[PDB]
Design a protein. Sequence first.
Lengths: 1341, 50, 251, 50, 268
Amino acid sequence: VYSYTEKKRIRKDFGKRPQVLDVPYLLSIQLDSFQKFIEQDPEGQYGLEAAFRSVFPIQSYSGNSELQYVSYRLGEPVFDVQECQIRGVTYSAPLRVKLRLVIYEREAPEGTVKDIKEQEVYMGEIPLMTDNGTFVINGTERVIVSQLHRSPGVFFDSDKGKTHSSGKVLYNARIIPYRGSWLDFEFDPKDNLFVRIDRRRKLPATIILRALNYTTEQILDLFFEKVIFEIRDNKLQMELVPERLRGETASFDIEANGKVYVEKGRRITARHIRQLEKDDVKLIEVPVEYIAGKVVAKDYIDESTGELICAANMELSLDLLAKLSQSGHKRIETLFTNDLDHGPYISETLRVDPTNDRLSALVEIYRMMRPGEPPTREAAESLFENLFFSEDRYDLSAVGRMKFNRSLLREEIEGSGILSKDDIIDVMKKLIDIRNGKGEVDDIDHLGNRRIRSVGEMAENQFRVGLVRVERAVKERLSLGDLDTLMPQDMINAKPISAAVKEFFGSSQLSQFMDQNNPLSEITHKRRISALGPGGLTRERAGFEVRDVHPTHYGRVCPIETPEGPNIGLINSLSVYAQTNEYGFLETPYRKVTDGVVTDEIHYLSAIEEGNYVIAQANSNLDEEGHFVEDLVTCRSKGESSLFSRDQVDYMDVSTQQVVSVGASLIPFLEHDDANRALMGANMQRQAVPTLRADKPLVGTGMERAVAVDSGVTAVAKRGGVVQYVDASRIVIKVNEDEMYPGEAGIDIYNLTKYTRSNQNTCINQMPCVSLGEPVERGDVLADGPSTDLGELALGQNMRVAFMPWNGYNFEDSILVSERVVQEDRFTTIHIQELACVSRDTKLGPEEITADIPNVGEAALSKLDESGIVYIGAEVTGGDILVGKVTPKGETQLTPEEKLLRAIFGEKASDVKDSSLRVPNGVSGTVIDVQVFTRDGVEKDKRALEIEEMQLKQAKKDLSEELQILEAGLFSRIRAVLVAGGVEAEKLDKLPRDRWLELGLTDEEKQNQLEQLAEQYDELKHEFEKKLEAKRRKITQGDDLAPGVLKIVKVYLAVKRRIQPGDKMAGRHGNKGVISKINPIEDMPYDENGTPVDIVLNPLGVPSRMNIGQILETHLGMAAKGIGDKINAMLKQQQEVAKLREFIQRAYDLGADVRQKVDLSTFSDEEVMRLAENLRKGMPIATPVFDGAKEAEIKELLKLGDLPTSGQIRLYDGRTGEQFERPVTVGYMYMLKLNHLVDDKMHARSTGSYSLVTQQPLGGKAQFGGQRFGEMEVWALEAYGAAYTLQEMLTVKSDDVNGRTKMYKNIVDGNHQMEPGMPESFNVLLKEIRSLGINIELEDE
Amino acid sequence: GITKASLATESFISAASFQETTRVLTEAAVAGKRDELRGLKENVIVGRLI
Amino acid sequence: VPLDGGRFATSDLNDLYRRVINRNNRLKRLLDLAAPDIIVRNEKRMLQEAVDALLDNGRRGRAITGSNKRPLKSLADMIKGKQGRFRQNLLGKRVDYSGRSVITVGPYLRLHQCGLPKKMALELFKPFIYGKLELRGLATTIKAAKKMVEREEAVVWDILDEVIREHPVLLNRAPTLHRLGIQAFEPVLIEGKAIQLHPLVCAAYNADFDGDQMAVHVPLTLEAQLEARALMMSTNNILSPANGEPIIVPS
Amino acid sequence: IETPITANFREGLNVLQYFISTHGARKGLADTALKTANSGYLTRRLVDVA
Amino acid sequence: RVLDATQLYLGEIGYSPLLTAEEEVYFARRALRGDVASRRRMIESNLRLVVKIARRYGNRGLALLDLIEEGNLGLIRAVEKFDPERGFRFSTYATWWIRQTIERAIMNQTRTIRLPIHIVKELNVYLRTARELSHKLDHEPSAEEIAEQLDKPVDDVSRMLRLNERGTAVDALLDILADEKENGPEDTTQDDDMKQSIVKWLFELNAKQREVLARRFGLLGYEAATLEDVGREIGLTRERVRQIQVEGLRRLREILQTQGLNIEALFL
RNA sequence: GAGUCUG
DNA sequence: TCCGCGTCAGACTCGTTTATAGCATACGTGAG
DNA sequence: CTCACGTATGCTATAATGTGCTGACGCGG
Ligand SMILES: [Mg+2]
Ligand SMILES: [Mg+2]
């Protein structure tokens, strides 16, 4: 069972592991997230709903007035994506919000029966996400990258040494909300518990409890266990708990009943403890001297006097015991604090605490955050309540509360966003438990603690900020104004919200220009996770621990895809099957194993859930429809991996691919490649420029088709059916009745995008895949995007490669290429550059775009037309004028040499200059397109007007063909309905179709169908009119540009760049090279058959690199092409369909344990020859990642091609004709031409413009800059002798202004003498130091 | 050791160009220090022959 | 200065000077008006704050944020930082008669030679061409010589070939760790945009041709030419200065 | 790591062995980006002193 | 550790007496008659009012402290021109003065280039109009749409919105920008060649032709004279000067056709 | 200033 | 607690959003 | 020599009189 587009060309699968779950939609993250932000939910606070309910209702300070939110609505987008991109506007929907101004009476108590004003107010346009996953901001496609941040909740961490060479582990708790101040608890070397609010100055931890109204005795009752002391007759007694002592040394002789258990001064072992517990020991007699030091729990007072004998938390003595006895207390509650397990931490912290009561504690807290400002009681209560106990300033969020409750071992997941008094104490309790030794510290890098924010959460936050800025304004105006005249819209401002959101989608770090070199580049960019940007890490902040691969990254984040750069480890590609949980943690699919039998039941497990189960490996062998073949299966749990029994196994990896990301999944023999090289391989695939002829990969994986389809760059069929009309522009498909809805006309039109500019100025061209009258299913590829073959992803071009040295032409990775590659225009690449010419208005007057330009040859003006615009199709070269422009000049005081020259030619040329847009120097191309943007008031250019004539007539034609094909398709249906119950075949075709409003039949369901089709026909009739009026308006519409700018002309140049020495090429195993030489065909090593190799790569760049993938790819590539050469030979000699069928079935069903079955047969003869015609240019094979082809399978395939098992061949030198003395490995490596063309990098400068202050030449090729001669480079001249070369570089070559001109004159005069001076940067330095008020003088000789 | 040795050089143009420029220039300004330009860095700064 | 867009762009020192002048002049006013002393004091604090911001912003506590939120760049900040003026504009500089491109092998070269692209060399030796053009009387003056080069006339190539003869060019690779990271070569004019490097010196540059680039620099004076040919030439820097072992070795 | 990789490239590495490889690999690559600067700062301190 | 100029000043203001109605009247009568203490006390007591307005006037131009000090200048003018005879309270009158002086300062100091209040006031009305338009038109105001609403010239509205654009910081952008007033060595060298050639060209044409031609354009002479002004030297003619000027240029045109320029140096 | 990059 | 340090060139992009009363006399320079 | 134009300083009156983003680097002296 294969699809129509797969019947045309089938990839051979060497995979063996049946896929229980298919690769999901890859651009899932971006779409789901943003869809949640705009998604209208009544309940589920997601994006805007949440944002309004959070802020609103806003009630005035007086409390008479309030503004409340009803609902919102997005207007439809003013401009489509197309018009936005051209015009350079943001693709957005207007946000209209219903809001109700309600007013209370001040005279009545809370009478709401005064004024209720409800109206729908504009608050900004929100940018919309494209169906692909992008935003068009100011006419530029951008991607907002998902973020990775610390999840709110609690975290328990510990400086492992660091502070105090003492080497003490200081434990700490950090409570992180989603919004609010941070709450820190920490230990000190002296075991005192401290609180840092918002990581400010340190305060004793007990002070925060006093602020929450805890008495001293209540604090102690919370952290400490009590020990009772009974004073009987004269001897002291204490209530014993058998264990407590445990691992202590007995300070007294412990006697129970009459009989001595402990010996004094010996350590109490487990035997003593079980003896005491079984004997049921509750009182033990003790010496009075043991209480010296014990801490009293409660306040104990003299019942006679009523005065305090001892305060709570006070160290007892022999005399306080005596006074207590005689007062009439024969029971004393003392603290249990035995070092080791139960530490007296809070007891010691209370002694450090300078505060006494609640107020004194609140004042001290207040004085910390606001130091200086006098306390008031109202101020201190307000501040403390507004820190962690205000619904408006503190919000843990659902994820915060959930992680918080799980960390404190609760049952309930959901709860308050504000901190409860119970929360804080439980956190302190756990901190102290961890100090004692029971309980552990959580991990920060653990993905259970790192959460994903995609777009919708981030858009939501910026939108809340906008609302908060609005709330101040609103509340302010509600209080001041009269309530009754004043409506809600005069109070709201849209500009704050629009500004907050605009700044996110445009200024933000995470909003970046889409990387569009190729489909894979796009798809991988949109599934990026960045730990950087706002609310995240910085490069400075980023350590080594975060960057490295964490255990939990398994199945969630790619271990082998990260920029090799400063961002190494902070930026991460998402794994293949990975997805975001409801709370935003990453999760991965796993197959449930029940009673040892491995079900197809699939569970997505979060980072924290994964730890708990034992998960078998994907490569683990399952036994034919039940359990594991092998007894001890290789699995992983508790973050580590070993053998397990079958009964212990809970789960298993869904695919072998789930560990890897998209980009790395496309690397064939990844299994045989070093992880470093593989990283750069996956990184360079993104840099691959699409060639003129998009060539499939012979050695693929199978992700090729998934990626091409999900990227969106391919046109895919929604409805299917038969193709009515193909064109190099459009595809019209007639839909099948089964999916075709009976309401609208059932004809789908896909308009293809023709040759368009990319962000990297590469070429985007869609060509039609299918032929005229081809039957297609839903999800069939109808048109190929730029770097896609029939449905598969095609980033470059496969080539006959031989590994062997040449005469140093492949020295260090240098690449030797055959001329045949250049001839066949393979790796010829198309680039489209955009140049603008801006007519501005100056103080002197407006600039003119005339062809009438002072001092210009007829040669130049030949190419400009009436208006001063170059013609479409015109070839241009550096210095040719594209758009002629002149800047008005005022009274210009010329010199005697200039006045004598202007007199000679008489070309005074009025009061105007020459500021024409001309082709940049050395770039040379053909003008493909011209666009003109004018203002509204200014009279249009003749050329602008003819452009609008074209767009108008073309628009009319487009819409007319819509209505025509839609009417024809619709009456074609009415014709079939009328035949249903009314045979009138020939009789209906003769009368005109235009007079079919009269035609009906009997009142049944079929008469109602006729009514549907008639109401749609007329609907389309008016719709066509209002569409045409819209188009006409946009074409006439004068565009509002920047202030100062009257009009803009955009020229698009087209360039065909040929492959050439200096150009950078790579494979997919991270194997790069620069092309050194293009060899004539004659010179290239050739086979026994006479066929020359395309590329000669250096053997020595393999065993060091440890990317062995490229060699396996080459052997298999040759085997693939072997079989293509056999099919090509059988097709050239026609032969039998039966014989081709035989060979091809034996081929597909080769592999030792091939998963993929292909029962050829069912294929019809016509399907088989279309298939062979595609297989002829080499049988495409798929080697999954970690479930790839084996050596033995590749050698078996080679034998099927009658190629050698070694995959080495005899080669003959093209030059000499003699044979090479040993066999050479030859085959097909799929090669990529990266964006790094020599054409773009070569730069040279003799003299140019110079910098403003420093007077040094500028930097960069765009500014025509001199190369920087850095400290390092200077030192080299210092090591040498070279003193004149150095001074040259310091002086006449850089700053020295007089020196440089004088030496230029000398060099044209041929003097080659320096005449040095003083570098100008120094004169500035002096001025800058005197500006500081330091006298810095030059002292003369 | 290296860092202090470089700051102990009796040229304040070299000391300033290395590190700690604010502190070097206050101590030189207060001492009324005179740099006679003997080392290589000093000559490279004024754009002279090494 | 006026940007092309009609807008202006200015140094942050202007914002700091304007702070200082406004507060100072307001202080003169409040002194002429005999203001109560609390207000005089506030103005004196604000005046000291403005001058301290102008001299060294960020030392006196919280730096004054301008337009973005970034602290205004003060006088001391232009001198101090690595980026100040010392490290950036003075102990190293941007340089005339300097170029770059991708490097590629030249196995045919001798050890003292390097492939230099035609168009690159045309531009670097522009004054030297102008000079010979006028001595041959082929160019009447400099602007006519410039237009002959712009037109890239056939006679100009022959002159350029004549100038480059026995003229050494410095090749540099980042990073320049030791002195052999700069070497002099006699250039060989080549059609095409890539620099051709002799294999045996690839060791000293740590040059591998997977896209590395090199700076070219033209020694102008007779002195600089001689220092390049005698001291800095490839051939003459065979042994490592760090050890007695040679650097030029076949691989 | 206590469990070594028994296999070689020719035989074929699994997802577990490959995942475990990655740690060392990326620490190496991060080392080149981050560590390069203290070496260079030592060159510069040395140069200034001599 | 109170180091901040702002917190110190606000501490000092809080430390003041708050005035009543009868107290304001008593002090105000003494103040206008010219009491020292009365003026001081009325100002010091009403500093708090300056701060309330200056606190809601931040993030628009200057800093809070800069906005408070300018506001204090309004307080002084308010105390000077307060009328205690009118039953109406001081706070009401002072509020006008404080807002006036703050706004005026914010319109001048905030922009590097001195902008007139006349234009700023016009701008205010254009922007308020834009706000009302934006609330009803889901889109934003066009220049023409604002001009229609105010019944004013489109060009005038465009000029105003053109002055709204603020200045950008060079600190970097400085290094992209290059000196446009300073010519490059190549250009300066070209001028040297021309100036040197002229001297040689003057002693190549006739003695009377290079005298008259040079001293007119100010090539050899000191001042660039005209056809009629060449008469001051020795020429003292109007027709003979014009024939001889052009005769010098015609012989020089053939000197440029033969050397190899003329149409070659016409493009230039 | 924030990016995505090549050594 | 405070402050002094952190490799060398190259490519590209973005960015400098927002606010405030109306009309009379006075001060000062420029244009016809 | 005179007026217009550009720019500035003036005065108005319900009462109102107390502030306020991003947090976390690491080694040495
Ligand atoms: Mg290696
Ligand atoms: Mg390299």
